[PDB]
């Protein structure tokens, strides 16, 4: 998971993107999210941030089907601090998110659907 910050250069603050392995309750407080695999993404320094989701799972091949509650990581950003703003910027900016597999990513049993 890569995130590109699209906010006014002159602004700063700190964010924390976090992961939480299969099964665990969605970490609702920073303090919780802070415990799992996570990176502190400084807005000021680098606009982009890549946080790889390791392959932490039971079976050799993780089920790609619609299961009851398959697990299943948890990528989520948190207000480490609260956004610092320069003089008079619109104060509201966005971030975009990108996802991609890795060279160690595979698939089997060609299934389908079309209508």
């Amino acid at each position: 998971f890569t995130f590109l910050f699209c906010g006014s250069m002159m602004a700063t603050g700190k964010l924390l993107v976090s992961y939480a392995p299969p099964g665990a309750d969605p970490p609702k407080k920073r303090k919780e999210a802070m415990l799992g695999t996570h990176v502190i993404w400084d807005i000021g320094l680098q606009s982009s941030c890549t946080m790889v989701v390791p392959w932490i799972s039971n079976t050799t091949y993780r089920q790609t089907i619609d299961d009851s509650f398959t697990e299943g990581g948890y990528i989520s950003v948190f207000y480490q601090t609260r956004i610092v703003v320069p003089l008079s910027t619109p104060r509201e900016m966005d971030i975009l998110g990108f996802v991609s597999a890795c060279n160690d990513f595979s698939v089997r049993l060609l299934r389908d659907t079309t209508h």
Partner: nanobody
Amino acid sequence: QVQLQESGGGSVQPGGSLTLSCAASGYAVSRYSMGWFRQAPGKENEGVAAIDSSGVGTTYADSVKGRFTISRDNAKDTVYLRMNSLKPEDTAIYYCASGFGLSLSRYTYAYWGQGTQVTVSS
């Protein structure tokens, strides 16, 4: 996948109340939680109430704190929005959605609804 219908929406009165509800599909509401967003006409989505299913602990927005209530029944597959002491601003396009949990945050909710309009000061 899951298509939960927003029920209980109607035009009431100032100082009044109104019960809202959303029935599950695709899954049993019990795993995902459920909440409500009142996107006031011409303004952004506005968080009001959220509650976790398999771990009941409610969260309210400060603009509606104390007056507004939210409850759940995982057995009837429905989520119960109790809006109390309703006022003229409380006239918005209400919405129910399912997320993780239980955290009024513009999103962090998956499947939404159709939009039920509660015109308090009718």
